[PDB]
Amino acid sequence: PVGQFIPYSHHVTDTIISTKNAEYLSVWKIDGRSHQSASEADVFQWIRELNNTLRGISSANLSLWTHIVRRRVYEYPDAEFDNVFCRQLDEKYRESFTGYNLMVNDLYLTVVYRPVDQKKHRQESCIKALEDINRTLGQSFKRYGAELLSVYEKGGHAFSAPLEFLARLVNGEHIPMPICRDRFSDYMAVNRPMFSKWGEVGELRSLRRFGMLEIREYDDATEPGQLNVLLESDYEFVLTHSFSVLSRPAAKEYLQRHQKNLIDARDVATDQIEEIDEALNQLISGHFVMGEHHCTLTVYGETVQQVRDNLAHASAAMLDVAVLPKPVDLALEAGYWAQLPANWQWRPRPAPITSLNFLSFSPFHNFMSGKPTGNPWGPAVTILKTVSGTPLYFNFHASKKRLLGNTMLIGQSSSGKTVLLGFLLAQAQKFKPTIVAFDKDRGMEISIRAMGGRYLPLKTGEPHANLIFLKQFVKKLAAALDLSTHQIYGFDITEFLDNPEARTPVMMYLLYRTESMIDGRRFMYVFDEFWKPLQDEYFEDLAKNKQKTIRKQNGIFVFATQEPSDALESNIAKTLIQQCATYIFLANPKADYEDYTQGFKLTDSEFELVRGLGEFSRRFLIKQGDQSALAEMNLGKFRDFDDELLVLSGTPDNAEIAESIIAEVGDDPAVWLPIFLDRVKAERS
Amino acid sequence: DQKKHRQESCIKALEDINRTLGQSFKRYGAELLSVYEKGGHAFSAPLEFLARLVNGEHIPMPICRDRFSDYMAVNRPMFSKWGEVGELRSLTGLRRF
Amino acid sequence: GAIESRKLLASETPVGQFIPYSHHVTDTIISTKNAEYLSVWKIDGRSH
Amino acid sequence: EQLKSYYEESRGLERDLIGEFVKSRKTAWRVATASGLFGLLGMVCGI
Amino acid sequence: QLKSYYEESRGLERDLIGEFVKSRKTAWRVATASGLFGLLGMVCGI
Amino acid sequence: RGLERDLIGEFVKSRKTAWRVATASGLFGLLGMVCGI
């Protein structure tokens, strides 16, 4: 049947998949670096840094395949959660997304090794070859972020992660395949593609038909990335590159052969011969390896007419750059079967290409997209639009016990902090965690009262292991508490935020009940200003000590601060600042350049983007891990954004109206908001 | 080196011919198609005309290290057998000439 | 078939045989496989 | 539930497949050439 | 010491196991031809 | 199943062919001997 074309046999060492002809393989899922954020210098430096390990480990056995896949992600489930106001917000903001891209970019580089009693010892040598190759590749890809796919247990019979990607490459849809006693190529093809008799187009059944554009460029690329125009598009596709690195002796012979062939001609072109001779000279001195290369683009369209239109648009976009696609009318079968790693024979037209040109054609550049699903709490907490028209799937747990959860939001309170804080909290309600909130203002209280939990403002007139409580109480002497009542809580810090010394004792006592009540159920601590609590003598020490255990539990500290220079990154605050997983920087009209850049390790070009947002532009820079993007949760007409923005923002008049209505209603099924709806806008009008 | 001599003499003669023709066609349009660069990479305006002749549609032609002949054609021609017309198969459409 | 497609395309004749062109030797002049140098004039014709 | 002890042997299985297959090729030429010579004996005897 | 672009290309494209299968098929075919010559000799003798 | 079922599969399938060739050679040789004698 179709088992002829697929060569993989069985799984070895828990991280390599053996193959027919004894050719060990290893798959890496790479999250590309953000090309947009960085300047022009960083991209060249990244290309050269990759070339470092490429030529460093280069050998005739080595080879690499690169696949980029644009997936219409359905892994977002549109979960259900009981609150009414958050339901309104969720539904409207889902409605806002109509007509916008939901495609994501996934990049894969699969390193493959094909060597050209003592049989077992030679087998050990062969496997340790790929062992060292993977080790050096991992060390070289630390900044990029590389997850070596490996087996993962499931209910007593294992699944191998690498098989899933190689399946997706041929099946076209993510199908979980387990490790069974068979050979993998026997049954990994759940879906067999059917190609046309003449071969112009191909068909795949879920039906999605596909067509292929052959791309081959024989001269050096001007730009570090010439194919990034495709990263935004309305068509799913798979783009492939194979680099079977030739050994140097073969490279010399090929160059001499091509040089002589160009010499023997009726018309002599002095420019091309000089260029090829220069490349020959560079080969010994500029130590870049050459390998056979071929590039194929496999778009996806429901109907052949739509497929042809997508091909035409891709060709036009490519010809905007100086790359001319050659359409494939026949041998589409060979080209498509060339996609599977270790299928050397079916390559349509390999062409020896310098390593620098290969990296220029396929550098790991992709827009930020995060991980829509699989996060430790569940699906992505929320999805945010970005500039350049690509969707961003926001999740807190993104790090470099368990991944870090702490988040930093830096910006002025007026500059969109309120709406973003409220929207993120409302989305995070979908997992139903416990929330403890401290607000620099009375703004948070209306938002909290909208949710299930009732805010507990602090006002004048309303105030054995307990040895710790007594000893902390003595420290102050020197100068409905628990989570049983309801899930969510809010305690005003506006009373003691500006106070010189009243904040410390009440913070010390409150942390007791707050931490001790749940203690391992879940935690999503929120502080509007976290630099005010940290100036304590005792609180910061316990935070730094116990962050490890809190991280072990389902505990995330969503810190925040209006001014980072105000937080001044004191000696005690250093750990809290540095262990932040995801940073969201708002537009800061005033930002001390040196402290801002050096404290956050923010790149110079990223700082240029932050300044570019300037003042009073409702955009933010999200730097998760080691990549960045300019995401704006702008709220316009396509039209409830007006009202759920009106309630979300917190003002003293809104605060007093909220408290009076809550106290006076008695029983109100969040019907104060309809009262709150018009009772406010009348005053502003 | 003598092939280079033929190159140089032929280029001089052809340049002389073009200059004379341009001087003769003052009343006419008399525009000489030449290389035009766009986007950090060179392009060939004359190649576009020859492509239009051979492909039937105006396709811009970047100039690369390989020879012009190998990558000139992007449309599959299908000349009829025992017929007086032919068909070009292209992504934009099918053209019968 | 996959092997059948390969043996068919191996039989197939490329179109490059009938297109005798090569490098731009000069900015305005094109070469040829038989060293027949070429130049194209775009003429805006006279009104008749 | 020895997950990898079960494929700790698959490696040696692949090695043994390669060894048996190359050994079979060797004995294939061995038998073929023996038949060739002995059939030459028969054919020349008949001639 | 590959010393050949053509050798490297062939080594990439060639399938090892299929090569062994074809080699054994040729071996058996040649042996069959030998058996044919032997039977011809038997008939000639008879 | 898998490669192992292929391993034993050939491991005795080639037994069959080797035995068949050996029997054919034995038959031919005994034929020659008997006819000559």
Residue numbers in the entry:
A (entry chain B): 15 to 130, 147 to 236, 240 to 433, 441 to 503, 515 to 530, 606 to 764, 775 to 821
B (entry chain A): 147 to 243
C (entry chain A): 2 to 49
D (entry chain E): 12 to 58
E (entry chain D): 13 to 58
F (entry chain F): 22 to 58
Recite the paper's sentences.
In Gram-negative bacteria, conjugation is mediated by a large transport apparatus—the conjugative type IV secretion system (T4SS)—produced by the donor cell and embedded in both its outer and inner membranes. Here we present a single-particle cryo-EM structure of a T4SS complex from the R388 plasmid that comprises all four sub-complexes: OMCC, stalk, arches and IMC.
The IMC is 1.32 MDa in size and 295 Å in diameter. Three of these protomers are occupied to a significant degree, whereas the occupancy of the three others is weaker. All protomers were related by an angle of 60°. The IMC is thus a hexameric structure with compositional heterogeneity (that is, variable occupancy of its constituent protomers) as defined by Huiskonen17, thereby limiting our ability to observe interactions and transitions in situ. The main component of the IMC is the AAA+ VirB4 ATPase, for which 12 subunits are present. One subunit (VirB4central) in each of the 6 dimers form a central hexamer with a diameter of 130 Å. The arches (the composition and architecture of which were previously unknown) are composed of hexamers of homotrimeric units of VirB8peri, forming a 177 Å diameter ring around the stalk.
